[PDB]
Amino acid sequence: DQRFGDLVFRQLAPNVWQHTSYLDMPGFGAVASNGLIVRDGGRVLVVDTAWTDDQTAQILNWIKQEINLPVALAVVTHAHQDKMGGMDALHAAGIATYANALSNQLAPQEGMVAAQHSLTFAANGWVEPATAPNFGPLKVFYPGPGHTSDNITVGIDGTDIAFGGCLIKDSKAKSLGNLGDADTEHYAASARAFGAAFPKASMIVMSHSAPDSRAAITHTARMADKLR
Ligand SMILES: [Zn+2]
Ligand SMILES: [Zn+2]
């Protein structure tokens, strides 16, 4: 781990890092949220903001110091603060931003700023490619409703990594957590669909646990079976 101001950065692969930021949730402590940073040749791609604009600007500062290449785009994985709270910092920096169309629709009511561009998805869950131009190795998949109605997931081609966002918890998790906007009926199937979309991913990254094996997916789905 690298502590950089109030954030933590961890290299996961030669061209992939996890960013971690924290917010006090009165009654729950200082809650960590993870996202990703990917170098694709001469540019950088970001998955998820930090909780705040100031923290997100710090992610960009870390990128400047540790990678020193332009950030071509960011994709955010649903309309909650941990994933979209720093949109204005991305826009101030001139970075093109993307989210599920449904996340952009929900953003104002959730207290978020919408991304500039909307992703749409085929019936099988894969992003419609025209809506995710220049995404390089980022493979975006809508697994179905689960943690939220709008949650999306991202695989990183050329690596063994897939990012479940807030949909997936690690294999030792006692409970799922953060179920306020969850689709309890469909959660298990959506977790399993994420796994099936990225069958070769042996490192599962997620918002509220450290990286784990694919047991994160099976355990999450088994936990979600109890919601039905
Ligand atoms: Zn959430
Ligand atoms: Zn979350």
178 marked among binding-site residues? yes
139 marked among binding-site residues? no
Query: Ligand 2 being an ion, which residues bring their Cβ within 5 A of it?
Result: 82, 166, 207
**Number of domains present in the structure of the chain:** 1
Structure solved via: X-ray
208 Cβ contact partners less than 8 Å away, ≥ 6 residues apart:
31, 32, 33, 34, 166, 169, 177, 178
Beta bridge partner(s), residue 4: 7
CA–centroid distance, 33 to ligand 2, in Å, is 6
169 marked among binding-site residues? yes
| Phi (first) and psi of residue 80, to 5 degrees | -120, 160
Q: What is the CATH number of the domain that holds 60?
A: 3.60.15.10
CA–centroid distance, 41 to ligand 1, in Å, is 31
This structure's resolution (angstroms)? 1.0
Give the chain's end-to-end CA distance (angstroms, integer). 38
117 marked among binding-site residues? no
* Domain housing 3: 1-228
